[PDB]
Amino acid sequence: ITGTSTVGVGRGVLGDQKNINTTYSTYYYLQDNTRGDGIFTYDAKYRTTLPGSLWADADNQFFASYDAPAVDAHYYAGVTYDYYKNVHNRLSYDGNNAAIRSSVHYSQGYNNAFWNGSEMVYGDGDGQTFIPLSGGIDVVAHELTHAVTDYTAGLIYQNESGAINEAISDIFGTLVEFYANKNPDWEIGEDVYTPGISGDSLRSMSDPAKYGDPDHYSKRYTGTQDNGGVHINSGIINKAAYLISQGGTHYGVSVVGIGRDKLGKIFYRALTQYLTPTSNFSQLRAAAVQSATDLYGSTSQEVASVKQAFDAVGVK
Ligand SMILES: N[C@@H](CCCC[NH3+])C(=O)O
Ligand SMILES: [Ca+2]
Ligand SMILES: [Ca+2]
Ligand SMILES: [Ca+2]
Ligand SMILES: [Ca+2]
Ligand SMILES: [Zn+2]
């Protein structure tokens, strides 16, 4: 829509108030013109046809409970865009400021969110397992990161390459959460997962086993479920990333942490420069080591920690 850029105010899924960039033209639309070619948020109206209708609002005030998921989807997509631009110098997911689109209120009682190859989609959850998914910043960054991966490495969504695809989304989803500095942690989706239970999450990077996910190559899932365990075996890579950043001793292997900042730089480089559509865990290890070598030298503590971390999760 062609209109006048302005700023509206609303309340997100968790009841927090925030300002959002909108566009005015008779109605106030959830169209952010301040970032690349724009961030557009649509209403799927409980249906499955996409994208739906660009979110129109009469007074630029988004305090209705129905508005909540839209406020967060729109706002968190903005934060994720900022993360990539300011930290990795990447303009949007394609690197050329492509418009970012998201639809909320997708279907009925849909307990998931996803990037469908062209846009992000968020279910409202069934109120038991999940509440509107866009309410989790790590969930939004996780999905948008799929767009980044699909435009760069292009990891196919199956077996080890798909687990890597999933881990990268969890890794950057987490880094974005730390970036926005909003109750950051190394868990996934804890802000929108099971409202009736405190302290749990969908997945854990610091301790994947906490929910039955493998934290070592020897425990990798080899079946065909979940496209060969893309959300399962991602735990092995998530654990490695956590160790690289925070350090620790895993299975008798000690790793000196180097921090989130360097973790992000190393993985972003591996993702955009060395990973390919069919890269496996072993190749990720090589990509990560080479990336750290490029950035800090082959005899650096950084290259050393990447090696220990992958040895710790049994990835050779
Ligand atoms: N996003 C993951 C976990 C979702 C859990 C149930 N929504 C998947 O689609 O498998
Ligand atoms: Ca309104
Ligand atoms: Ca958190
Ligand atoms: Ca989190
Ligand atoms: Ca919970
Ligand atoms: Zn994913």
Is residue 116 included in any domain, yes or no? yes
Cα 28 to chain centroid, rounded? 28
- How many whole angstroms separate alpha carbon 196 and alpha carbon 129? 9
Q: Are residues 39 and 134 in the same domain?
A: yes
Using CA atoms, how far apart are residues 187 and 16, in angstroms rounded to an integer?
21
Question: Whole domain around residue 119: which residue ranges?
Answer: 6-154
Q: What protein residues have CB closer than 5 angstroms to ion ligand 3?
A: 183, 185
Distance CA(112)–CA(194), nearest Å, equals 13
Tokens encoding 67: 């508005």
Please indicate, yes or no, if residue 258 is contained in any of the structural domains. yes
The reply to whether 160 and 299 lie within a common domain is yes
Alpha-carbon span 152 to 138, nearest angstrom = 20
Query: Ligand 4 being an ion, which residues bring their Cβ within 5 A of it?
Result: 138, 177, 187
Indicate whether 224 and 293 sit together in one domain.
yes
**CB-based pocket (< 6 A), ligand 1:** 111-112, 202, 231
What φ, ψ does residue 58 adopt, rounded to 5°? Answer: -75, -35
Binding site, by residue number, is 57, 59, 61, 138, 142, 146, 166, 177, 183, 185, 187, 190, 193-194, 197, 200
Phi, psi of 56 (to 5 degrees): -110, 140
Quick one: CA dihedral 88, 90, 91, 93, positive or negative?
negative
Are 24 and 150 in a shared domain?
A: yes
Give the C-alpha separation, 175 to 166, whole Å: 14
Q: d(Cα 109, Cα 127) in Å, to the nearest integer?
A: 8
Query: Distance between CA 118 and CA 64 in Å, rounded?
Result: 28
Query: Are residue 246 and residue 281 in the same domain, yes or no?
Result: yes
Which atom of ligand 1 is found nearest the CA of 230? Answer: 10
Beta bridge pairs of residue 23: 5, 29
Instruction: Among 154, 176, 197, identify where a domain stops.
Output: 154
Query: Of the residues 231, 232, 233, 238, which should be mutated to test ligand 1's pocket, given the most ligand atoms within 8 Å of the CB?
Result: 231
Run of H or E including 80? helix 68-88
d(CA 233, CA 221): 6
Rounded Cα distance between 136 and 175, Å, is: 13
CATH number of the domain residue 10 falls in:
3.10.170.10
Q: Which two tokens stand for residue 244?
A: 């690289």
- The 10 Å Cβ neighbour count of residue 94 is 15
Closest CA to 232 of 216, 248, 214, 250: 214
The protein residue whose alpha carbon is closest to atom 7 in ligand 1 is 112
* Active-site annotation holder among 88, 105, 231, 250: 231
- Cβ within 8 Å of residue 14, ≥6 positions away: 135, 191
Alpha helices, DSSP H, located in 134-280: 137-151, 159-179, 225-229, 234-246, 260-269
- Tell me, yes or no, whether 273 lies in a domain: yes
* Residue at 298 is within a domain: yes
Q: Has 250 been annotated as catalytic?
A: no
DSSP string, 197-260: SSS--SEESS-GGGGT--SSGGG---SSHHHHHTTTTHHHHHHHHHHHHHEEEETTEEEE---H
Residue given tokens 């220990």 in the structure block: 308
Name every residue whose Cβ is closer than 8 Å to that of residue 96 and which is 6 or more positions away in sequence.
Answer: none
Instruction: Say whether both 119 and 244 belong to one domain.
Output: no
Per the residue annotation, which of 143, 160, 250, 302 is the catalytic one?
143
Task: Output DSSP code: residue 298.
Answer: T
Atom 9 of ligand 1: nearest residue by CA position? 112
Q: How far is the CA of 110 from the centre of ligand 4 (A)?
A: 20
In a domain, 201, yes or no: yes
Reference 134, options 172, 178, 179, 102; nearest CA is: 102
- Distance, C-alpha 198 to centroid of its chain: 22
C-beta of residue 13 within 8 angstroms of C-beta of residue 192: yes
Instruction: Clarify whether residues 119 and 242 are in a common domain.
Output: no
**Quick one: how many helices (H) and strands (E) in the chain?**
8, 15
Specify whether 145 is located in the same domain as 160.
no
Resolution of the determined structure in angstroms stands at 2.2
Annotated binding residues for Zn(2+), written as ranges, equal 142, 146, 166
In a domain, 191, yes or no: yes
Do both 139 and 163 map to the same domain?
A: no
Report the b/e string of 115-143 with b at 16+ CB within 10 A: beeebbbbbbbeeeebbbbbbbbbbbbbb
Cα distances (Å, whole numbers) of residue 203 to 24, 49, 188, 228, 251: 40, 29, 5, 17, 20
d(CA 69, CA 14): 10
The total of structural domains in the chain comes to 2
